[PDB]
């Protein structure tokens, strides 16, 4: 007698779960997540924005870092997402319960967020998290303005259908810094060709490489910092080795072409 | 450096996950779940009803047992629930994707089901499962009829706000058998007194004991069979030692009174 298997929790590298203090990126923009997951806090005179929250169990750490920055729960106005996987949108439901924040996302991300990442096109129910509702649906190229910082959505479907880059202009040393928070361009274990759940997967990825290459991009940040060669633990040198958006897109495309060739061979 | 803890999966006793073949309860009614979780299949000339599905990973086993019974995915018309915890509603989302089934539930169970059991009044996010939407909302005492079997909802709030007993009349040996599928009356680790998330918890449980005592009840079944002294592995004697609804309610109330006294002492 063999019982059905136990449910398996979504476990990750310890660095993904390693708390860090807030690391300033530009005058209004801070990394407040963990060593290996991005969660960006943007502070304005008219409230704060969070872009991604990381894993589900990061909610309280995020709230601590906001507090350290001067941002109370009522000051958090808006949550934006790169994509609605558990390691980026994980604590969103809880953050909505514990703060004033409302979520803006595109339709694809909203429907995946609302089912807590279940029935994923590639992962099935293997990587789920508490579901949350979007409060605003955004379209490609739409802007959201908070405390006068202007965030623009750039859709870059592929990693998930709803993958989005967010761009905004901050400052440092009195000069503008065009920040591009580009989503993942990876396809981990995905069936790329002839996938019945995502028939135009390859065309979407190619289009997304071109989108990312062309972003306004003085500084690139990514949901997994290593993807853009950030090292959040490296202090004053954390961003020193960061890729350009062009280099990030080129590397992702070369990796993707390799994966396609391997899929054909396997 | 101490990272945040990994997520912990909801793991259960192996007997809860031990597949069994269909066990007939009455002419139209079969247990098709596992040794220690109830999932009742009711077959009519106008489609089938499932009452509970057990754990999330039981979906395929349920579908196998339906097939063994003559019930194809398109023949499954209706899913009813005792309560929307992971060990009873776990596979509902997947069953909806893979069958014709629609879900009927009361409002409390629908909202908990739709958030996949997250933000539970007592468990928090400790016991979550894939979310699903209800297709029909039922009121207390409302009837649903399928292929001419009449199911009546009897609300028995306490274990969850949306806890429901379902009753119907089947036959055996040409005589009616009034079957009562009563929900859990347990309060595992619950704060009973002065609970800010459930202020009238104790009054609801007392009312629910009285509801259960009074059900039409030739045969009692419960979501955890041991609660009503069923032994699904005992073959022709599986139901021999089953409690009456009266005895089940009395035992739950005595246990509940003990728990209250212990809570006061602790
Ligand atoms: O390769 C990836 O993109 C990462 C690293 S591990 C893999 C599965 S979980 C996470 C979803 S973004 N993913
Ligand atoms: O005591 C109970 O009612 C059972 C047994 S174990 C405990 C927590 S999980 C499940 C929810 S019904 N519950
Ligand atoms: Zn992802
Ligand atoms: Zn990720
Ligand atoms: Zn329960
Ligand atoms: Zn249970």
Resolution in Å, one decimal place: 1.6
Helix, coil or strand: residue A34: strand
Alpha-helix runs per DSSP H in chain A: 59-68, 86-89, 92-98, 107-114, 201-213, 245-265
Q: What number of C-beta contacts closer than 8 Å exist between A and B?
A: 100
Report the domain count for chain B.
1
Interface of B with A (CB under 8 A): 1, 3-12, 14-19, 34, 55-58, 61, 93-94, 97, 114-116, 118-119, 125, 128, 130-131
CATH number at residue B48: 3.60.15.10
Identify from A4, A5, A16, A120 which residue to disrupt to test chain B contact, counting B C-beta atoms within 10 A and taking the largest count. A4
Range of the domain at A106: 1-266
Q: Are A25 and A52 in contact (CB under 8 A)?
A: no
- Measured CA to CA, the distance from residue A168 to residue B120 in angstroms comes to 38
Report the alpha-carbon distance of residue A155 to residue B56 in Å, rounded.
Answer: 33
Cα separation, A256 vs A206, in Å, equals: 9
Distance of CA A3 to the CA centre of its chain: 38
A85 touches ligand 1 (CB under 6 Å): yes
Residues in chain B with CB shorter than 8 Å from the CB of A114 are 131
Q: Which helix (H) or strand (E) holds B50?
A: strand B47-51
Query: A135: number of CA atoms within 13 Å, CB side?
Result: 12
- Alpha carbons B154 and B83: distance in angstroms, whole number: 12
* 3-class DSSP string for B81-121: CCCCCHHHHCCHHHHHHHCCCEEEECHHHHHHHHCCCCCEC
Whether A88 contacts A81, CB under 8 Å: yes
**By what technique were these coordinates determined?**
X-ray
Long-range contacts of B230-236 (CB under 8 A, 24+ apart): B232/B20, B232/B23, B232/B31, B232/B34, B232/B35, B232/B36, B233/B20, B233/B35, B235/B23
Query: Which one, of A215, A81, A124, A13, lies nearest residue B93 by Cα?
Result: A124
- Listed in sequence order, the DSSP H helices in A85-136 are 86-89, 92-98, 107-114
Q: Which DSSP letter does residue A5 get?
A: P
Specify whether the CB–CB gap between A217 and A170 falls below 8 A: no
| CB-nearest partner of A8 from B9, B17, B128 | B9
Cβ atoms B140, B163 nearer than 8 A: no
Neighbours of A122 (CB within 10 A): 17
Helix (H) or strand (E) holding A104: strand A102-105
In terms of Cβ atoms closer than 10 Å to its own Cβ (0-12, 13-18, 19+), residue A17 is buried
- Residues A242/A228, Cβ–Cβ less than 8 Å: yes
């Amino acid at each position: 007698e063999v019982p059905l298997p136990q449910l398996r929790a979504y476990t990750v590298d310890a660095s993904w779960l390693q708390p860090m203090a807030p690391l300033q990126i530009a005058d209004h923009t801070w990394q407040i997540g963990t060593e290996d997951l991005t969660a960006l806090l943007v502070q304005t005179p008219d409230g704060a924005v969070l872009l991604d929250g990381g894993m589900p169990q990061m909610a309280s750490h995020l709230l601590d870092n906001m507090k350290a920055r001067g941002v109370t729960p009522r000051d958090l106005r808006l949550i934006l997402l790169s994509h609605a996987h558990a390691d980026h949108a994980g604590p969103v439901a809880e953050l909505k319960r514990r703060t004033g924040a409302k979520v803006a996302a595109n339709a694809e991300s909203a429907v995946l967020l609302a089912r807590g990442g279940s029935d994923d096109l590639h992962f099935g129910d293997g990587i789920t998290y508490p579901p949350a509702n979007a409060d605003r649906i955004v379209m490609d190229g739409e802007v959201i303005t908070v405390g006068g910082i202007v965030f623009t959505a750039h859709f870059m479907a592929g990693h998930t259908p709803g993958s989005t880059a967010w761009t905004w202009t901050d400052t440092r040393n009195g000069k503008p810094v065009r920040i591009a928070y580009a989503d993942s361009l990876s396809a981990p274990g995905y069936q790329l060709q002839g996938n019945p759940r995502y028939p135009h997967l390859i065309e979407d990825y190619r289009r997304s490489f071109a989108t990312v290459r062309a972003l306004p991009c003085d500084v690139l940040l990514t949901p997994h910092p290593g993807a853009s060669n950030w090292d959040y633990a490296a202090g004053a040198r954390a961003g020193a080795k960061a890729l350009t958006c062009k280099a990030y897109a080129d590397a992702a495309e070369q990796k993707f072409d390799g994966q396609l060739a391997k899929e054909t061979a396997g």
